[PDB]
From Swiss-Prot:
Gene behind this protein: sirB
Upper classification of the organism: Bacteria, Bacillati, Bacillota, Bacilli, Bacillales
InterPro entries associated with the record: CbiX-like (IPR002762), Sirohydro_Cobaltochel/CbiX (IPR050963)
Species, as recorded: Bacillus subtilis (strain 168)
Protein name, UniProt field: Sirohydrochlorin ferrochelatase
Catalyzed reactions: siroheme + 2 H(+) = sirohydrochlorin + Fe(2+)
EC supergroup of this enzyme: lyase
């Protein structure tokens, strides 16, 4: 037996984002006791999935644990990535494949949100938290962001956590913002639940400036990014996919 890890990010065309994702995945390798480890990306950035998978095979891997670097569960985890996996794996029918889950609802990621809150330096006890995800038409995305909000609610003595979204599913973060123009003395933290900055993050920044014009007790944290606790959660995913102790991550054909 020879085990491999194939990390799969979604990929970016922004050079800085490519570099950050690649460096994160590279820094994961020293934490995994597996002799063959390759990084790959679905799109816009190579190594491609095909390249990384074939590299794993060429180095003698009998088992490949494919682990997607994804915060939430949507089309990429269910369709695009598995489709590329089946396309390349069809050529090596003797190689056993396991395929992991996105990070999703994990206590470590809640800790990442908590530390982003703490970084502001404002008391958070009995404060409101507004957790902004990108959003998706896939209901699993809203469900998981809500689960993270509930876990934060259980773990930190905040007043409440409001999951909301930039697009595709409700409630939209602008509706929450419009409802927060009051200023009732309650502090509101805005946590962008995103791996990278970019257009939508810039939009959040501008909208939070507008909101602060109405309600000065509003504080925007930096986006989650590749926080150390995000790394802990992702390493959990990697280890469970490689262990595959019950076969629950077996890469079975058919539509996901």
């Amino acid at each position: 037996m020879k085990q491999a890890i194939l990390y799969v990010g979604h990929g970016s065309r922004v050079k800085k984002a490519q570099q950050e994702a690649a460096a994160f995945l590279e820094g994961c390798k020293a934490h995994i006791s597996v002799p063959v480890q390759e990084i790959s990306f679905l799109e816009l950035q190579e190594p491609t999935i095909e390249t990384g998978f074939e590299a794993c095979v060429k180095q003698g891997a009998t088992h490949i644990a494919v682990v997607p670097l994804l915060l939430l569960t949507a089309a990429h985890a269910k369709h695009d990535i598995p489709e590329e996996i089946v396309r390349v794996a069809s050529r090596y029918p003797s190689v056993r494949i396991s395929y992991g889950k996105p990070i999703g609802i994990d206590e470590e990621v809640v800790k990442a949100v908590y530390h982003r809150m703490k970084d502001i330096g404002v008391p958070y006890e009995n404060a409101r938290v507004v957790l902004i995800g990108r959003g998706s038409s896939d209901p699993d995305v809203k469900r998981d962001v809500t689960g993270i909000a509930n876990l934060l609610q259980e773990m930190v003595p905040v007043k409440e956590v409001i999951p909301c979204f930039l697009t595709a599913c409700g409630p939209n973060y602008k509706e929450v913002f419009s409802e927060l123009e009051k200023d009732d003395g309650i502090t509101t933290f805005i946590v962008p639940y995103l791996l990278f900055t970019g257009m939508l993050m810039n939009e959040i920044e501008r909208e939070v400036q507008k909101l602060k014009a109405h309600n000065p007790n509003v504080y925007l944290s930096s986006y989650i990014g590749f926080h150390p606790h995000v790394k802990n959660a992702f390493l959990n995913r990697v280890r469970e996919t490689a262990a595959n102790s019950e076969g629950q991550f077996d890469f079975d054909g058919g539509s996901y």
